[PDB]
Design an enzyme around this catalytic site. Structure first.
Site, PDB file in Angstrom:
ATOM      1  CD  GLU A  35       4.597   1.119   7.629  1.00 26.58           C
ATOM      2  OE1 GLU A  35       4.609   1.009   6.382  1.00 26.58           O
ATOM      3  OE2 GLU A  35       3.549   1.040   8.306  1.00 26.58           O
ATOM      4  CG  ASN A  46       0.180   1.875  -2.651  1.00 21.34           C
ATOM      5  OD1 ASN A  46       0.223   0.807  -2.040  1.00 21.34           O
ATOM      6  ND2 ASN A  46       0.835   2.973  -2.234  1.00 21.34           N
ATOM      7  CG  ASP A  49      -3.586   5.571  -3.868  1.00 25.21           C
ATOM      8  OD1 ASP A  49      -2.520   5.008  -4.225  1.00 25.21           O
ATOM      9  OD2 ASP A  49      -3.764   5.988  -2.710  1.00 25.21           O
ATOM     10  CB  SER A  51      -0.146   7.207  -3.556  1.00 21.24           C
ATOM     11  OG  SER A  51      -0.498   6.050  -2.809  1.00 21.24           O
ATOM     12  CG  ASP A  53       3.202   3.632   0.965  1.00 22.14           C
ATOM     13  OD1 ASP A  53       2.507   4.582   1.361  1.00 22.14           O
ATOM     14  OD2 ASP A  53       2.716   2.570   0.536  1.00 22.14           O
ATOM     15  CG  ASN A  60       0.574   7.431   0.307  1.00 27.34           C
ATOM     16  OD1 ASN A  60      -0.177   8.245  -0.184  1.00 27.34           O
ATOM     17  ND2 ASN A  60       0.793   6.250  -0.241  1.00 27.34           N
TER      18      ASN A  60
END
Ligand code: NA
Length: 130
Positions: A35, A46, A49, A51, A53, A60
């Site tokens: 990750e 991202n 959308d 959002s 991480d 998220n």
């Protein structure tokens, strides 16, 4: 900060992650490696959308933490995403635990499913004395 492998394994163990919801310490390690490369400052935006991480576990902002800029956000960990960018990972670990209490458990993370699930992950803890 970027944790060294055994340093992170010992930290996660101290924070009660080994066997949490049946998830071994080696699996948590594999998750963190794929990750974020064990980087507490990692963030992935991202644009689709809108959002992002956050942190070592790449949690998220749409479902777990609040960054005050993500549409359709639920803040299931009731936590500022800024808490997931700290060198002290206690807040992140508590949130990671919350994530895995949902039906999918650790399968929530696609990278973990692709790079860790059903595979040998013993190399993540070998030599750490954990
Ligand atoms: Na949220």
């Amino acid at each position: 900060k970027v944790f060294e492998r055994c340093e992170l394994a010992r930290t996660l163990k101290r924070l009660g992650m080994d066997g949490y919801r049946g998830i071994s310490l080696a699996n948590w390690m594999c998750l963190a490696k794929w990750e974020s490369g064990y980087n507490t400052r990692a963030t992935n935006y991202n644009a689709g959308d809108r959002s992002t991480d956050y942190g070592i576990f790449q949690i998220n902002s749409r479902y777990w933490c609040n960054d005050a800029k993500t549409p359709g956000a639920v803040n299931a960990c009731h936590l500022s995403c800024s808490a997931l960018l700290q060198d002290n990972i206690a807040d992140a670990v508590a949130c990671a635990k919350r994530v895995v209490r949902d039906p999918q458990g650790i399968r929530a993370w696609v990278a973990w499913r692709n790079r860790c699930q059903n595979r040998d992950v013993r190399q993540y803890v070998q030599g750490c004395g954990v």
